[PDB]
A paper describes a structure:
Lytic polysaccharide monooxygenases (LPMOs; also designated PMOs) are copper metalloenzymes that perform unique redox chemistry resulting in disruption of polysaccharide chains by oxygen atom insertion at the glycosidic bond. The LPMO active site is highly conserved and contains a mononuclear Cu2+ center within a “histidine brace” motif in which the copper is coordinated by the N-terminal histidine amino group, the Nδ atom of His1 and the Nε atom of a second conserved histidine in the equatorial plane. In the Cu2+ resting state, the remaining equatorial and axial positions are each occupied by a water molecule. Of particular commercial and biotechnological interest is the ability of fungal LPMOs to catalyze the oxidative cleavage of recalcitrant crystalline cellulose at the C1 and/or C4 position, thereby enhancing polysaccharide depolymerization by increasing glucan access to hydrolytic enzymes and ensuring efficient bioconversion.
Residue numbers in the entry: 1 to 223
The structure:
Amino acid sequence: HTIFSSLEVNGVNQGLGEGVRVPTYNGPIEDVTSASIACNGSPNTVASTSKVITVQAGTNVTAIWRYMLSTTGDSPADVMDSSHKGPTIAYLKKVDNAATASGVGNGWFKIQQDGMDSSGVWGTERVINGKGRHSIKIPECIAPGQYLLRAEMIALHAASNYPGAQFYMECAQLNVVGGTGAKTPSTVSFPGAYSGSDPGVKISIYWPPVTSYTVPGPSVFTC
Ligand SMILES: *[C@@H]1O[C@H](CO)[C@@H](O[C@@H]2O[C@H](CO)[C@@H](O)[C@H](O)[C@H]2NC(C)=O)[C@H](O)[C@H]1NC(C)=O
Ligand SMILES: [Cu+2]
């Protein structure tokens, strides 16, 4: 249980729920075929926001994960329970108007992921123990303009069967400045990119203890 509730750019937090479409309830999406897998949604309720956040292409945005909207600390319990081991992931989608695009459908491309490393540590654990900071590089080579950023943590502690994996995601609204447009990523859809049978979705992280993890979704776009 966690919420990507604010975004930091060039050292400046853009504000609670400002430019990030936040639910007030921190519960996960569990059906990967639901329209809610794109930018969260029913049976949660997601707020709108008229802020569109400017970011220079080639630089990083940092998603700031917190347990609830009311949370004002950054200790591990203020981010997400340590049982919630799994990957962190981020995607972009080029849109006409970042304040009105729903995010549902085709156009997403992956720009960051962090599953399990050589020492058996998970991406969510680096966020939980790293003050909730989830750093994400905006590619320099993409087209400028309006985008959605979908940042996600998947908790796998209850994922031995499907349904079981717990998908926590929120969409930020970006104005990307300075992109060269030299490369046009191949894209996937939400819902669509994930399936209940994926080896990183239906998985026991206990039996046997996991030594290598396949993050769901497409490969990471690189310039
Ligand atoms: C910008 O975000 C990228 C990820 O999109 C960060 O790169 C990862 O950084 C970690 C931590 O040092 C490494 O474990 C990874 O190998 C990096 N991944 C890749 C693909 O390069 C990067 O550190 C971030 N930069 C800043 C300044 O926050
Ligand atoms: Cu939870």
